[PDB]
Amino acid sequence: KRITTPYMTKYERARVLGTRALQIAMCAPVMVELEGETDPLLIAMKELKARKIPIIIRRYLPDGSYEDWGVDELIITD
Amino acid sequence: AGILFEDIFDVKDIDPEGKKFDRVSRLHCESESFKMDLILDVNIQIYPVDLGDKFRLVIASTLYEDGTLDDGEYNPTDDRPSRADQFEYVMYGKVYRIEGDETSTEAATRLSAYVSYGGLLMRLQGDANNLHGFEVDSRVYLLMKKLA
Amino acid sequence: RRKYQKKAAACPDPSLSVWRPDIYFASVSETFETKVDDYSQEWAAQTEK
Numbered sequence: 001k002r003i004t005t006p007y008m009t010k011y012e013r014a015r016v017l018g019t020r021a022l023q024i025a026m027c028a029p030v031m032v033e034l035e036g037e038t039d040p041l042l043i044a045m046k047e048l049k050a051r052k053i054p055i056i057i058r059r060y061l062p063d064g065s066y067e068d069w070g071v072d073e074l075i076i077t078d
Numbered sequence: 079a080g081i082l083f084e085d086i087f088d089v090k091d092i093d094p095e096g097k098k099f100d101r102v103s104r105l106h107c108e109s110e111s112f113k114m115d116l117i118l119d120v121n122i123q124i125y126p127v128d129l130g131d132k133f134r135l136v137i138a139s140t141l142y143e144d145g146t147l148d149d150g151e152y153n154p155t156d157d158r159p160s161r162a163d164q165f166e167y168v169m170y171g172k173v174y175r176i177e178g179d180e181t182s183t184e185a186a187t188r189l190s191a192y193v194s195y196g197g198l199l200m201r202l203q204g205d206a207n208n209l210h211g212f213e214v215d216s217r218v219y220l221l222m223k224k225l226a
Numbered sequence: 227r228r229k230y231q232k233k234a235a236a237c238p239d240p241s242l243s244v245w246r247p248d249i250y251f252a253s254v255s256e257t258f259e260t261k262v263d264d265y266s267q268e269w270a271a272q273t274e275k
Binding site: 002005 | 246248
């Protein structure tokens, strides 16, 4: 188990959507077929809701020892 | 046929609380046959109405005399025999609240109907079986025709 | 002796204190469980009537 919580921490989703808009901004393979708008800020919702995020989130526990979390393992919800 | 209620009506007193609008009157009217009671708003501009006037009332769940419940959206060009062609006054509607019965009631006599037609309020009361079919989220079409 | 010394210790320490509310479900604090309980037995008896 983990002494963190499977649940969506707003800073995580926000910052890593910034990271993914960076990713597809620069040279990065297009996983989800870009249905029009080239901008990955508008396709970032598509990335996430299609779960094309192999990104490794290094949640850091009190000091040093961390966790790693792929964003699908959370409770991303409305 | 889907007459959810019907009655004949004449009015007793029009506005008992001053005239405080422009396009509406707040009617207070009573039935004779059954001891119902109608409080209703009626645009007097495009439908003048007086005190001593009499009119028959009905409240349908559809205006088709085939009684089928097919309604997507009023399409203005269409024409076929509907229940309106004998009346003089239409209003779409929605019933949103039925009050009078609190607990497991041993005699549910007085039950009220609360309807507002897109902004015009209507209050009718009566028994607790005649006034049935009236669920929540229950569209009805008020109809009316002044009778001599 | 045992019979008595059983009923001597505190109503155990708060839920929030032993169970971290992130992991474990339903980790409410005292003056909020009283609230949800308030409304539970205050609405049901209301709505049925």
